[PDB]
C-alpha cells in the first residue's frame, strides 16, 4: 500500500533523509543503505525546546537494498512548528541533519475519477481529489497530454476541470493528473492518476 508511496521518493538520492506526512498528523523518515551489513545508528529529534526524544529504527529488505526508517508520534506532528531530526552512526559521525515543517512534506494519493469527453468548443477533462485526504479545497493539480509528444498544463488551487481546446485531429491522446498541497502548505507531487484515452475528431 504505502510501500509504493515511499518508492516514489527514494530516487531523491541518498544525501537527504526522505520524510513525508500522509495527513499532517503523522510522519515517517527513511534512507536506503544497500546491504552488501546492518550496522547500528541512532535517530534523535527535537520538537522546539522540549527534551530530545529518540525514535526506534526498523530494518527491512526491499530488493537488494536495505531500508532503515522510523515513525513519529501524532502529538509531536500535529503542529506547524519546526522539528529537528538527526541520524547518527554509533561512532558519533553524523549521517543526516535536517529541519522540517511537517506541513511542508505532505505526499498525497493519486487523484481518481478522470474523465475525457468532447465539448462547440473542439475537449473537457474532469477528475476527483485524492480520496481519504482532507483539505481538498487547496490541492494543486497538473495534467499531462501525450500523442511522440508530451505537454503539462498546471491547474491551481481547487480546480477539477480542464478546458483544452488547442488540439490535433485524427491522433490518439493520453491524459493523467497528479496532485500536491499548495502558500501555507507544501509537499511532493503525487503519483499520476490512471490515464484516460481519446481519439480526436476530423
Amino acid at each position: 500500500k504505502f510501500e509504493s508511496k515511499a518508492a516514489l521518493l527514494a530516487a531523491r538520492g541518498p544525501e537527504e533523509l526522505l520524510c513525508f506526512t500522509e495527513r499532517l498528523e503523522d510522519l515517517v523518515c527513511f534512507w536506503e543503505e544497500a546491504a552488501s551489513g546492518p550496522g547500528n545508528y541512532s535517530f534523535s529529534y527535537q520538537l522546539e525546546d522540549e527534551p530530545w526524544k529518540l525514535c526506534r529504527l526498523h530494518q527491512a529488505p526491499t530488493a537488494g537494498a536495505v531500508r532503515f526508517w522510523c515513525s513519529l508520534p501524532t502529538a509531536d506532528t500535529s503542529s506547524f512548528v519546526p522539528l529537528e531530526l538527526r541520524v547518527t552512526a554509533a561512532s558519533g559521525a553524523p549521517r543526516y541533519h535536517r529541519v522540517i515543517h511537517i506541513n511542508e512534506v505532505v505526499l498525497l494519493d493519486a487523484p481518481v475519477g478522470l474523465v475525457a469527453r468532447l465539448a462547440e468548443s473542439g475537449v473537457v477533462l474532469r477528475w476527483l481529489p485524492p480520496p481519504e485526504t482532507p483539505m481538498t479545497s487547496h490541492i494543486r493539480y497538473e495534467v499531462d497530454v501525450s500523442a511522440g509528444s508530451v505537454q503539462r498544463v498546471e491547474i491551481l488551487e481547487g480546480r477539477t476541470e480542464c478546458v483544452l481546446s488547442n488540439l490535433r485531429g485524427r491522433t490518439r491522446y493520453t491524459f493523467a493528473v497528479r496532485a500536491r498541497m499548495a502558500p501555507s502548505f507544501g509537499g511532493f507531487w503525487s503519483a499520476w492518476s490512471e490515464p484516460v484515452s481519446l481519439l480526436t475528431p476530423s
Epitope: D49, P51, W52, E84, T88, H97, R98, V99, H101
Partner: antibody, heavy 117, light 108 residues
Framework: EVQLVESGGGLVQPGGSLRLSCAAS????????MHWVRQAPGKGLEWVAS????????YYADSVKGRFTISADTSKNTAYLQMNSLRAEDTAVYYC??????????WGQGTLVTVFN | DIQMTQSPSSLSASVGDRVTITCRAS??????VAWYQQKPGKAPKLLIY???SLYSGVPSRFSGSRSGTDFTLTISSLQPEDFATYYC?????????FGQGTKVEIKR
C-alpha cells in the same frame, strides 16, 4: 526557572590548564545538546564544542581539537570544558548554551579566561 | 568548511527606520540559521530560528527571510532598544559558524 551558571575562569599562563563548569537547573542536562561558545574581547562569537544527549558524542571546532574536552556529569546536572595547552589567543569570555528551536535558546552569563604572559 | 559572510558590518539609522541585515552562506547548507541580538556586557539573545520563525516573546518588527544562499534579517521600525550587534548562525552536521557581526548605530 531555566538557568545556566558558569564558573572556573581566571588567569592562566601559556600552556597551563583550566576547567570550566556549567551548572544547569530547571531542565535535565542529559536530554539536551550543550554548546560552549567563546568571545574574544572586542570580537565576535566562535563556536567551541558540543555534546549530544544520552550518547555524549563530542564535536569540537578545528581550533580547539586535542586540547579541549567537553564532558558532562548527569548526577550533578553539570557540563564541563577542560582546556589544556592554553594559548594567548584563547583569551575570551566563555559561554555555555542549551540547544532549542534549532539554535541556542538559553545562555549562561559567561566566565572570562585570561591567558597572560 | 562553511563560511558566513555578514554584511554590512555596521550601519547608522534613525529611530523608526527600516533596516535589513544580510548573511551569505559560502555554500550549500541547511536552513538551520538563527539570529541573535547582543548588547554590551550581555549574552546573545535568540531572536529568529529556522531562518524565519519569531522566537517566543520577540516583537513583530523582527522578520526573517531567505532567498537562495542569502539569509536576511529585517527590523521594520527601529526602536531605541534595537540598537545593538546582530549575528547570524548556521549549523550543518557538527560545525556551527557565525557571521562576523553587524553593529546598528543611531543616526543623530
Amino acid at each position: 526557572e531555566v538557568q545556566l551558571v558558569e564558573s572556573g575562569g581566571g588567569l592562566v599562563q601559556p600552556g597551563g590548564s583550566l576547567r570550566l563548569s556549567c551548572a544547569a537547573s530547571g531542565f535535565n542536562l542529559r536530554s539536551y545538546y550543550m554548546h560552549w561558545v567563546r568571545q574574544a574581547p572586542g570580537k565576535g562569537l566562535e563556536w567551541v564544542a558540543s555534546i549530544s544527549p544520552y550518547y555524549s558524542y563530542t564535536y569540537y571546532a578545528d581550533s580547539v581539537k586535542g586540547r579541549f574536552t567537553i564532558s558532562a556529569d548527569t548526577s550533578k546536572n553539570t557540563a564541563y570544558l577542560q582546556m589544556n595547552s592554553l594559548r594567548a589567543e584563547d583569551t575570551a569570555v566563555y559561554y555555555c548554551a542549551r540547544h532549542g528551536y534549532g539554535a541556542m535558546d538559553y545562555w549562561g552569563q559567561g566566565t572570562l579566561v585570561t591567558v597572560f604572559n | 568548511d562553511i563560511q558566513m559572510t555578514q554584511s554590512p558590518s555596521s550601519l547608522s539609522a534613525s529611530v523608526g527606520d527600516r533596516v535589513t541585515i544580510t548573511c551569505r552562506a559560502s555554500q550549500s547548507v541547511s536552513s538551520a540559521v538563527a539570529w541573535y541580538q547582543q548588547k554590551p556586557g550581555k549574552a546573545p539573545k535568540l531572536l529568529i530560528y529556522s531562518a524565519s520563525s519569531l522566537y517566543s516573546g520577540v516583537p513583530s518588527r523582527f522578520s526573517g527571510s531567505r532567498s537562495g544562499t542569502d539569509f536576511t534579517l529585517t527590523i521594520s521600525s527601529l526602536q531605541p532598544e534595537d540598537f545593538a550587534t546582530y549575528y547570524c548562525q548556521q549549523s550543518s552536521y557538527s560545525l556551527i559558524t557565525f557571521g562576523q557581526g553587524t553593529k546598528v548605530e543611531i543616526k543623530r
